[PDB]
């Protein structure tokens, strides 16, 4: 799991569950291409979406579906999504982790790096 | 603009928060906190002259935020009692201090920037 | 009264981020990013005029701030390439518009507010 | 598992806030805070183990962070003396609680999720 992306519900108090999780990377001609998707679970965190083989140095950006969770949620948000764009494995192999808290027209996103 | 300030936004709104009691203390020489200025958030959510310049001498201080007012009158049952900020002052000259304060029902973040006058 | 205002303060150094590079996209029909307005940034972090009212459509917007071109002339080595706010303008009507980003090495966050 | 959790990081690093003390107290009727639980922060970050559920009761709580100490070993000037983050706890029934706070030198934020177990 080089990848994990973390989503909580500030509003609820309780982790966001059933976000679409997209992830990009940004290919030779300056254009996004899929690579990976996934669905975030009940403890509002989703993982596995990556593997170490797959992820190799480049441009990502993640993009997670904010904008339907709150319409389900019955809520009107401002956000159509979040987006993280970050250069990856630039000096070597590295952990990369996503945490995202989520509010109805607010969130923050805050990455922590470990090498191994 | 006052060495102290306190702006607080909300976030299930996306607006200022609107009269939210906010209140002061200062160090005391036996360790113990001691009213210094009460203040009453506008609409804007910015307050200022809550305390004078003269009137503001280096030492420890304290500022609160009456987090279960905004929400127990909008009906939202509140995580935190309250938000307390605690910092030092006029280490070196007489600087400005913004507190900025974002609110959300089961959380807030605070942020400091000083300006030079 | 500009509709859209971006504000960006730096946490490290505790003091609003000064030559930062700002970015504006509005989505096409092709569902392509076309750029709309650009700006840099001044030392107190606020800055207007990016925009007009009357030249203000519903649509798809994205505001992209250079946070990698400010923290490496300070020094330290970023994470994030830049930070990107995607939302939805006009939905119900006119209105005005306040995007806040507080900006750290490793984290950023955003907060919407509106008038 | 543990009724309370907090959990801890550091912003211009990118790394878990190693080293941080954390302290808990417990308000009384006389409205004197007791200390209730210390402890210190792990190198990932996060404190687990803090209360048991059977010591754990009914009353508003509060939850300090010694953000001045961290900074200074690390080198970095500080402006927050602590964190403080205070709530009611088991109003209603026994819930899970855990408090997030992310930590830069000149700002933080925190975060409360709560969850019936």
Known sequence: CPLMVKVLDAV?????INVAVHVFRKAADDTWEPFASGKTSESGELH???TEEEFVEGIYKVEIDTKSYWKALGISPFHEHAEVVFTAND???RRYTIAALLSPY???????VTNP
């Open 12 to 16: 609820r108090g309780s982790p966001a």
């Open 91 to 93: 000096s070597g192999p």
């Open 48 to 50: 596995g979406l990556t």
């Open 106 to 112: 607010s969130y923050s996103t805050t990455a922590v």
